[PDB]
Symmetry: D2
Subunit: 243 residues, 4 copies
């Protein structure tokens, strides 16, 4: 997370940390609890190649990473089949936990938007996570969960920005239709936030508009953050995740 | 190059080394001379973002890197407008030297193939460069130009193998048509060879069939190397390079 | 600490951590509270060259590094005038706090030994700290305080071992008189523990026998840990720390 | 070498390069040819712990390291018995080649100074090597052999310099009698030059006055290069090396 700051402990009850087995269960990606037994994340965080579930764990809402670890095993990794790379698209995945979690004020699901929802450009949204606080710049210990207010941006406008200073032809799609974008040169998500959530308060309730996907660096000029548009894959998600 | 030997002084007279400015003019990609004023290379070596031409130079064939440097300035960098990432495709580009080079037995251009050339399996080809000699293993000083004979396989054979051990649907094409496939777990090109040539001997003449592009690691099981299919972009090349 | 276990919250009330300014107040060495206003540590941790005091801070006993920081500023760095390198000797130093500390059962001083105490082999001694759990292997987060019981051996026994597999002449002392040795190939202190305490229970009381100094690697064969012998420097310590 | 330049092909015909086995025979220290079959160097380059000879080699005068390599095996490694660390002293050693090298105008021995010889402070001397061109920054490829003119300085005046900005007491020796110093904030030897020679032209003839040993950083303020004084160990060398 670039810009923004440490999050109050009562905020973002659905944020989660993905841990991979090594000298210690290390955080490699963010995620979100969208259902007592399901975690929404970014496909590249766990794909394209097949993974060994034995080496993966999910950590629910934690104020400071690693301090009060309570690792939860995963039973299934469902990576969207159209995924191969973040730039191409369909960068979204599902993690089924072996046991549902006992929700509470402190830890509970976030809500998916309805297939109609669109989130207008210049709409206040928040992205959260434990990622780098800047290009090649780790979040130092005690590893607090961070948050930043980032403005949504019209799909075509981000595509347009990504063509500036680039040899890529203007009519060649870079930011694709299954993507969403937010951020500026001051506020943005970075490495370590991947698979994390982008949420916006709509009519007084929180909806996940996106999943932290990719981008050319973090908060770079004319290089806004690119996210996997959630509304776009709701049908795929609901094929596994009960309504 | 993985699984090769040091190349003799009389071979690959068209090989070139691209140099980036820094504490010293470091080698970051390969290339090939297709004309006294033009060099063929990979688009991901110089793009998708526009670079400062000043920080780039070209070194013509050397037996060992940095020892007999005679760096040459570049006046133009032309990247195929279709390019953005190597996996997507169109990983091809051109460089125009500020002056034409005097050709000879030790350094002359390579012949481009006719639009109808296929390069089918069985037919032996070679790939050259100064890249790593294995995953994460840099070429050791004095940095000799290496060569290796690589087996060519049909595009659909490689595509099917890139799906083995992957979540990507067998239906989603990975190895695209503007691409060419070669190598195995003992012979392959690695990081540092990108942009360099892949040549096959046809009717006694040497033809550049590909441009070192990408792959999942080097010489890895079920992940043969992927090269930009040169015949697919001939028309584009001729919009800049004389026939 | 090498080959230990995580330490209980009620043990080692004198153990402290030294922090140096940077992206965050990072732990670089260990120490011990010997007086409400004084901290004992290794001279190599803060010298031989004079440092900017403002850039230094001291953290009192903590169960997990960085979790609950309450950094305390330092007004004076006092390094034994005889120190230059640890192998040579006099690897001892004093830190005076700008303010005295309020002691309790969780945070109190350690008892220094009487000038005549020896600590012969077969004595119960422990060494604590936040250092590496092995050679080039950092203590993984949440960074718990570790402890390990180390076997103490006579100086001449360690001096002879350091000579095995070495070109240094036998009559050329390596482990010097103002030094003490402990540990084996399974129990030792490592990088990061430097300056911390080595305590031994003697007749119901805990006494600081030495200060973690140096060694060739950690827990390496014939290379036991070497500590500055505290009894050797009582007179010096007392020219600053009131009796 | 800091603040110097590439050496003319016909200077320092005695400079040598020490190679250690690994992915390739990498340079780790310098040395000098003092007899057709003996190489003078620093003990900290090959000790204090015993090394395996099969892993060591010797490369003679080379304009560019690694280019025209012709490694020579070493029959024996003689490390002064009083050596343990560079700061303590006796940082000198001898390498006995398996064969006598055939001297020539381009490759011959340097001369040892007479026991009574005293290089006056201010003496115009030269230090050669392939070490870093500055603190933490390697010598770029093609790795030319550098040289720099460094002024010798009085042993006492250096000891004093090293106490400035240091807690070490004034009457406590840092720069000892078996050492000598040279260089300033613009001219000095650096990591990789260790074991190399420090020659001075005396009465029309080159004498090796020092062996690159140690120092705090390279070219740092009030931290001149410290070298093992050769004259001091003439008797020890002649005990092995003929006349
Ligand atoms: C992401 O955090 C970044 C975010 C970039 C910002 C988003 C908006 N502004 C910029 N995305 C990124 O780097 O995308 C690259 C796409 C081309 C991120 N951090 O790290 C990654 C890549 C990554 C690193 C490591 C892993 C991993 O270790 N996964 C484990 C390995 C494993 C072994 C056994 C069992 C399970 C697993 C999963 C995965 C991805 N992206
Ligand atoms: C390529 O060598 C690899 C080859 C992989 C093998 C092929 C067959 N088996 C595997 N490909 C690769 O890494 O692909 C990545 C995905 C597309 C290679 N090595 O490094 C790259 C990437 C790269 C590294 C460095 C630069 C660079 O520094 N370019 C300079 C920057 C600059 C500034 C000013 C002026 C000019 C320049 C060019 C570019 C690309 N690919
Ligand atoms: C010590 O932990 C090791 C312990 C080794 C074991 C003991 C028994 N078995 C082996 N000792 C060591 O490495 O000694 C080396 C010399 C002989 C240790 N870890 O790191 C050190 C050295 C060291 C590293 C870093 C600093 C430092 O950064 N100090 C800061 C700089 C600064 C600037 C401004 C204000 C204050 C400061 C302090 C210091 C020492 N020893
Ligand atoms: C020396 O180049 C530096 C020079 C510093 C300058 C001198 C005047 N201004 C500063 N000295 C140094 O760092 O001293 C530190 C002492 C306290 C140098 N560079 O690196 C070293 C240390 C060193 C590194 C590596 C080796 C080595 O690899 N030796 C091999 C290991 C081996 C295995 C099998 C068979 C043979 C060998 C030899 C040795 C020393 N000093």
């Amino acid at each position: 997370i670039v810009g923004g700051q440490e999050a109050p402990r009562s905020k973002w009850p659905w944020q989660v940390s993905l841990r991979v087995h090594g000298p210690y269960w290390m955080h490699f990606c963010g995620g979100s609890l969208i259902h007592p037994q399901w975690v929404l994340t970014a496909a590249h965080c766990v794909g394209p190649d097949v993974k060994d579930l034995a080496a993966l764990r999910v950590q629910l809402r934690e104020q400071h990473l690693y301090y009060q670890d309570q690792l939860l095993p995963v039973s299934r990794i469902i990576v969207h089949p159209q995924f191969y790379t973040a730039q191409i698209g369909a960068d979204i995945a599902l993690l089924e936990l072996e046991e549902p979690v006992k929700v509470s004020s402190h830890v509970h699901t976030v809500t998916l938007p309805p297939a109609s929802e669109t989130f207008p450009p210049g709409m206040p949204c928040w992205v959260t996570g434990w990622g780098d606080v800047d290009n090649d710049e780790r979040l130092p210990p005690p590893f607090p969960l961070k948050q930043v207010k980032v403005p949504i941006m019209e799909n075509h406008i981000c595509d347009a920005k990504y063509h500036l200073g680039a040899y890529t032809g203007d009519d060649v799609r870079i930011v694709r239709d299954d993507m969403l974008c937010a951020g500026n040169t001051r506020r943005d998500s970075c490495q370590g936030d991947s698979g994390g959530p982008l949420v916006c308060k709509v009519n007084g309730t929180w909806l996940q508009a996106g999943v932290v996907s990719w981008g050319e660096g973090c908060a770079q000029p004319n290089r806004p953050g690119i996210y996997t548009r959630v509304t776009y894959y709701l049908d795929w998600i609901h094929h596994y995740v009960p309504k």
